[model samples]
Target: TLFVEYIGYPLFSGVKFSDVPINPHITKFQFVLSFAVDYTASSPHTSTNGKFNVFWDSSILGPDQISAIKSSHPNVRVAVSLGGASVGSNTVQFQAASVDSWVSNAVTSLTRIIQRYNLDGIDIDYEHFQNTDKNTFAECIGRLITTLKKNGVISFASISPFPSVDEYYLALFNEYKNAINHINYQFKAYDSSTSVDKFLGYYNNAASKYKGGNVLISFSTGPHPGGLPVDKGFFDAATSLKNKGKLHGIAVWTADTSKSSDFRYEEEAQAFLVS
Candidate 1:
């Protein structure tokens, strides 16, 4: 199985890629560096109307760290996500002038970042939309992924979707499902009422929603109101799911916050996947 995680960016948590522990037995480990947004790289990083820029903390997660991590751990591969929950105080809106224009600009800019960073893939995590409708969001993102893969700019791609934006992402999944490699569902974003049984239900539901896609079980290290916390039965829930033959992969939300606890959750999560 695989243990994937999102690390760095937005928070500037001062956590470096090498700080996260990696289980040697885990065959595949993916480090998704948080967010490369189509916005101007300024304080509070404003939107660029499709011109993507490196919003992630480049000082720490730059090419040197990427090379060092991969060289140290042969099982590791690194990727960068696009459009997180927000930039600074502003929400990230998935609006583009047109599908062609957005796709072209995104491909050009993202290709440069990916190449310069020695990244292996991209993750779509646009969580908000203003004027753009579901179909338009689907087309813009769908075309961008298609173009990136067609040109061999990235080896794999994933989509991060929660229940609230299911419609928008589902529209994209329905169309360009083939281009995507995994579904990083934010089960942590569910109501705080999430229990062990409810987690399984959500997992099962996501599996159905993204049928034929690799839907990974997920949790967040941040102080979110939701997610079955590690100490609170997250692993118990994962074990139950594994016993049911449903635990294909496991993912963590961010490495930044996990640093405080010495990434105890990250270590345990990888151990559980291998166990």
Candidate 2:
């Protein structure tokens, strides 16, 4: 299996935020999630909710910089993750297509951003929302997909789920399986010490249901309460799935902390995952 995750996010500190903290890696590039997209806001990362920070602001994560990121690592697919932990689940602004204004504008706005930045796709990192109205949420997401799919601009789409694969996301994913590519479970946020059997079991159980997306296990590296360390830790666990044909790939929480750990297991993890 061509392992297809191991994503990273580059969140920058700004004074117009010109420089972002990303990594230069070995092996072929698959996909990298450039922090977030402000789906519920008009401007980039300046949400009144303060739900998002890392954005596709060319000044920091600007246009040429994104192109440069691709140039530096050939064949790298990039998607701006929309709605992170900070964007709460109770949010009706982006979650309710029933609202009409929220999702309709979301489609138009994100399409423009994708074309402007030459991006490949968008990720639904709905880590904070509650699934009280899953159907409405799913339709809103579907509406976005419907519009974007027409542009042929979106090459991939995925979601990060937690609290044990809620029925709402499951229902939504099953409805649009073909449009979705991977499900990068928030393994660490749920439990940092989650073992491989439990992790694989997590996927198998979910697979029995949605039966669409591949599994890309995730772990944090720093500042987000981290998962297992890379060195001999998660590298071994994630790659073991690769060996058994149960792996989609691994995802690092953020590239910002890569240097802090001496850029430890990313390169090594990639080589082994694909081996």
Candidate 3:
């Protein structure tokens, strides 16, 4: 079974990779280091057009930490995500100069970071776009993932897309679904209206949306809670899907938020995934 956790967010939370529990039964456990944004060096939150840089708290989740965690837990694979909802007060916009140039820069920068960190994969989590069309976004990200995989810079990749921006991610997945190993669909974006059945519907909807993709069942450990609440049969839904062999495994939004709760949800998620 697979389980993914997004870390390094709510920056400076002092949440280490070792702080999160890893179930021994999980066949694949991925800790997606929150984000590596394409932002300029001089500006705190300005987009660099396409040149990416590490925005995560590298002091705690740096190269040595990545290697040490993987060494201690042989099943762990660390990946760095691209973009996030916001940086400081600015939304991370996918302002690529051009598909070719963007891909070139992304590949160059991400390759350096991946190599230095001994990372195993990449996760596309860009949550905002500005003056960029879906086609351009698709082409840039698709080519980026393809080139990285072709060069053996990354062994796996995944995309995080919520409902509103599903169209954009759909375009990307349609073109490069093969290169994407999983769909970390943010089910929590659906709001409190979601029930267990509704969650399953969304799961099936995403499975169809990204056909043949390993679409993960997901939730957030953050405030402004939404989607199917854990207390409201979230795992029951997972149990049903697992029974039917449709469960591709689970994912959560951030370790920063989960840390306050002592990672109870994270532990339970893994336990459920491997049950």
Candidate 4:
């Protein structure tokens, strides 16, 4: 009877800890904390110019929250995400249209934050790009990575998991694989309702194609409507793929204090790995 313990919560009932087999691959536990710092300032410059400014001071979370996260997960990797639906329309298009301008602003803003705190990497969460400008978006990513690497910083990108299987996106990734540290496959749970197998298939294809490459494949998950969880099955699928050497890790969507309790899955995941 081996019971798995998660952040102190038991995932499975009526099992003893001694029954679970220790995992050899997971030497130590590490959590990646990510925050979405939406592009509020640049939204106005884009098509939908809203009145309110969604600017974040970075200190909005305060030092206390940061300290708690650091203390709880000492080896945590903190990353700031930029660009999302709340920001504006055609984020990738805007970025692609003005690569130099976007990169310059991103570098300047990100550098300031990097110097201000202890962070492991940066995540680009630009979504819903125009089909025509997809290549330009990818190119901008490559250039941004080069710039970040020159400053000794690691770069990661969040991409749509069920994209149109376009050759351009594949080629772009192949070309810049070395510049990227990790690729967080944004596989939303609702999208999997049509068929989880289909969702997994897309990830499998990418993983196999990029095998032996430096970039790591990470699956992203979130919470359900009634406070239920959507990550359990996704993690199991990701782990199976990873066991076959297809992925490297998993990344949670966020760690905002408002949704702090939603992270109960972490303990279960950790226990599963250890077992």
Candidate 5:
């Protein structure tokens, strides 16, 4: 199983090794640096005007935290996720007019980011985009991916709602499935209410469609109107899938929320994964 965990950037500023508590099921700790859009607002991957910031000053309290987490969890991997929930020219409204420039800047900015933090890969969390430009988006992403793969780096994705409806993301994934290592699909986002059974089936269906990219099902640990509680049979569904080898791994919406959730899904999920 390929369990990938997400760490929110600003949330990380206050986190320490001691704050992590116990349980380590994470194969990769995907620190969401977030939206370095050429358009607007941001996260760790700051949208400082039209620039990207991977060497964020708010990482785990200090630069020492980079070696701190990695050296401690020698087996766990770390990655930087880009573009999430932020609307901009580099993200939300990624027009083809800026596609070429976006690809070039992304490669340079992200490479610098991961190198500085000893991270492994990138997760495309572009929550805003439509089919307006179509193939242009795919081309830009593919170029960036090609450049990265040429340099021995990897990229992945995070999908929202459901694949049955999120064709925009799926199409982009299909464009570069070979380059993308995995698709960490969000099982609970948007207002789409679904059950474990249905979500698992959607996961299975997606895996069948995109065999090149490993697929992981994710649930929101925080209280969201559309999200599922992990204790409410989400674990049971994942365990069943793990047994059947019908999937890759599982992910949570965030690390902070999971810490204060019903049953703390990370604890139980980590136990199951490490076992």
Candidate 6:
């Protein structure tokens, strides 16, 4: 059971967990492998405008790479993440100022992608939202969920960590917990210097604040050297949370081989999940 996102809507078209076939002789642990693709306008930059030009080209990744990954992990889930802090500025502004149009465009784009690739769900990664657009943002998310539900797609959102000025996020969760399939708390290991216990305490406190106990509480940790300590500690904390029946899951920073090689601690961070 994996979730994928296209634009703002989720699609139920990926391989299911039960359907994933593995080598019966191999005794390795079975874990969910998911990848996030950058679909925001900032990708494939060709000029100073920093807007992406490529629309739908499987050639960019090359057929071999996709086939190899799928062959290696047939059960892995891949999702397109839109509206990061960079490329999504325009979309975010639109979502804030004119939600109806924004959602309409999002749905249209997502529908095309889902039908084309048959994804599993959608992930909303809208970042750096201001106070003024809080209500509109929530409404936009609600509408996204509604649209996905109408089409039978799973819905997920990647959110920033708790105990911040982002009061609207809390309000949104309060208003529409049932609609959200999962919430990945973006926990950047490189940004903080707190001890592992302290960080875990912060995450636990935030998770406790959410009204819906059934809502999945997952964490996103980095694999870079600067983020290694936090990443390792966070996973350990996630394991502890799971033992207490509170942990939902963990989402890695990415699966990009090029970027993964640059981090000296990448192997160590990934081992936490694979092992």
Better of 4 and 5 by TM-score: 5
Residue 209 lDDT (model 6): 72
- Tens digit of per-residue lDDT, candidate 1, span 1-275: 88888987537688888888989999989999888888777776666777987777789889998999999999999988888988877788888888888888888888898999999998889999776899999899888888888899899999999998999999999988898898989888887777888888888899999999889888887865677777788888888888988887988877887877789998888888887
In candidate 2, what are the lDDT values of residues 1-275, reduced to their tens digit? 33234234334423121122223443434455554544443423233221333443456556676687677666465677776554333242334424466566677677777778777877776643453366666777776776687779787777777655466678678677777777766666546566656666765765666575776776665655544545525666666666777776666655555556654545556566555
On TM-score, the candidate that comes out on top is 3
**Tens digit of lDDT per residue, candidate 5, span 1-275?**
45666665334344443455345545555444443344433432323322455333344534467567667776555566665554422344444447767677777876776666666666666555553454676677677767877887654444333544355666777787666766777777534465777766666776776666677777766655554457676777777887887657677666656556533566677677666
Candidate 5: pairs in clash: 33-45
Provide the TM-score for each candidate, comma-separated.
0.96, 0.77, 0.97, 0.65, 0.80, 0.64
Model 2, position 126, has a per-residue lDDT of 62
Candidate 3 on 119-238: residue-level lDDT in tens?
Answer: 999999887766688999999999999999999999999999998898889999988878899889898889797788878888888888788988888888887778898757898898
Question: Alpha carbon lDDT of residue 209, candidate 1?
Answer: 93
Worst 10 residues of 3 by lDDT: 40-49
Q: What's the C-alpha lDDT at position 73 in model 5?
A: 72
- Please report the TM-score between candidate 3 and the true structure: 0.97
Q: How close to the true structure is residue 195 of candidate 5, measured as C-alpha lDDT? A: 72
Evaluate all candidate structures by whole-model CA lDDT and list the values in order: 0.86, 0.58, 0.88, 0.45, 0.59, 0.45
Model 4's TM-score against the true structure: 0.65
- Could you tell me the lDDT of residue 35 within candidate 2? 49
Candidate with the larger lDDT of 2 and 3? 3
Which residue segments of model 6 deviate by more than 4 Å? 1-58, 61-72, 88-94, 153-165, 189-191, 213-232, 257-275
Predicted candidate 3, C-alpha RMSD: 1.1
Poorest stretch of ten by lDDT in candidate 6 = 1-10
Specify the highest-lDDT model's number. 3
Question: What shift in Å separates residue 97 of candidate 5 from its native position after superposition?
Answer: 2.2
